[PDB]
């Protein structure tokens, strides 16, 4: 992937750039990754943004909050296998409620795997309120969270199925 080109295109709100995938690109300077995320905020067309295994941490991923809360088109966000903290992940998921454009949010296998009770309770309630999410790549230890999340995702899947059928 051409990170530099993506940055320029996203900033100009390129109507054709729908997918940006920089998975496994650990070489990219963190300032560039930060600029890429910031650029994505200007696009009302981007549908998929993947930064899996790019060795990013909270400092580089914080900008995703603005992207998620601003984007009306982002459908898939993948930040798995990085160094993001449970607290930041909770904030990212809660931010999905602003526009609810995202249907797939994957963030499993972070270096710090244990989310902790407070984070799981945050996430389960945020997800339960989200009507668009169909897939959430997060491992919960809490029975209640697992159950409420599964139910919410299934509820959302049924909402889509019925809409496809004309209700």
């Amino acid at each position: 992937t051409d990170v530099e080109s993506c940055i320029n295109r996203l900033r100009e709100d390129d109507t054709d750039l729908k997918e940006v995938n920089i998975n496994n690109m650990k070489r990219v300077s963190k300032e560039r990754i930060r600029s890429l995320i910031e650029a994505a905020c200007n696009s009302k067309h981007i549908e998929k943004f993947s930064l899996a295994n790019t060795a990013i941490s909270d400092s580089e991923a914080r900008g995703l909050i603005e992207l998620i809360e601003t984007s009306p088109s982002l459908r898939v966000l993948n930040v798995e296998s990085n160094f993001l903290t449970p607290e930041l992940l909770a904030r990212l998921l809660r931010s999905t409620l602003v526009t609810q454009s995202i249907v797939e949010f994957k963030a499993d296998n972070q270096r710090q795997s244990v989310l902790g009770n407070q984070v799981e309770m945050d996430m389960m309630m945020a997800i339960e309120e989200n009507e668009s999410l169909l897939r959430v790549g997060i491992s919960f230890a809490s029975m209640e969270a697992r159950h409420r999340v599964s139910e919410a995702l299934e509820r959302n899947y049924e909402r889509v199925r019925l809409r496809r059928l004309g209700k």
Side-chain angles (χ1 to χ4, degrees):
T1 296
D2 190 322
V3 178
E4 211 55 45
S5 180
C6 287
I7 289 176
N8 290 310
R9 294 180 65 192
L10 287 170
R11 287 180 177 166
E12 303 181 304
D13 188 31
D14 187 290
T15 182
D16 309 303
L17 181 51
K18 306 299 182 57
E19 167 163 42
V20 175
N21 189 318
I22 63 175
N23 289 350
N24 312 302
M25 295 183 86
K26 300 176 174 180
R27 61 147 192 178
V28 184
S29 66
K30 308 311 168 180
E31 191 176 310
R32 287 290 69 182
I33 291 180
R34 283 182 170 181
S35 55
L36 177 64
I37 291 169
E38 183 179 1
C41 294
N42 301 299
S43 168
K44 55 180 173 59
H45 302 285
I46 182 172
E47 289 173 24
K48 300 182 180 183
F49 189 23
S50 192
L51 316 75
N53 191 48
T54 52
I56 54 173
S57 70
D58 283 13
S59 49
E60 296 81 55
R62 232 120 59 187
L64 289 181
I65 292 174
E66 192 191 324
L67 175 61
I68 297 173
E69 296 183 4
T70 298
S71 181
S73 61
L74 191 58
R75 302 265 301 178
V76 176
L77 179 60
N78 183 359
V79 297
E80 77 188 319
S81 297
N82 286 304
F83 298 98
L84 304 186
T85 68
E87 298 60 48
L88 180 52
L89 292 184
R91 294 177 63 199
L92 297 179
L93 263 174
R94 190 152 285 270
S95 64
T96 67
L97 296 174
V98 180
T99 68
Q100 291 184 44
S101 65
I102 298 176
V103 303
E104 180 174 300
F105 179 97
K106 205 307 177 302
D108 217 329
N109 297 306
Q110 297 304 316
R111 176 52 68 68
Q112 293 183 54
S113 55
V114 181
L115 301 172
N117 189 59
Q118 296 195 179
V119 167
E120 291 203 16
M121 305 296 203
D122 182 328
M123 293 185 160
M124 67 173 210
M125 296 312 284
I127 293 170
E128 190 170 275
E129 196 182 324
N130 190 303
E131 295 178 0
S132 299
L133 292 173
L134 299 176
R135 288 175 289 296
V136 174
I138 292 182
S139 182
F140 295 93
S142 169
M143 288 300 288
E144 191 186 330
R146 299 181 61 172
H147 173 67
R148 299 181 72 159
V149 167
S150 63
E151 288 298 300
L153 296 187
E154 276 302 304
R155 169 201 71 198
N156 294 347
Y157 178 94
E158 284 304 307
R159 180 154 151 292
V160 170
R161 189 179 69 80
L162 293 184
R163 195 164 70 66
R164 293 169 178 165
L165 300 180
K167 272 202 175 186

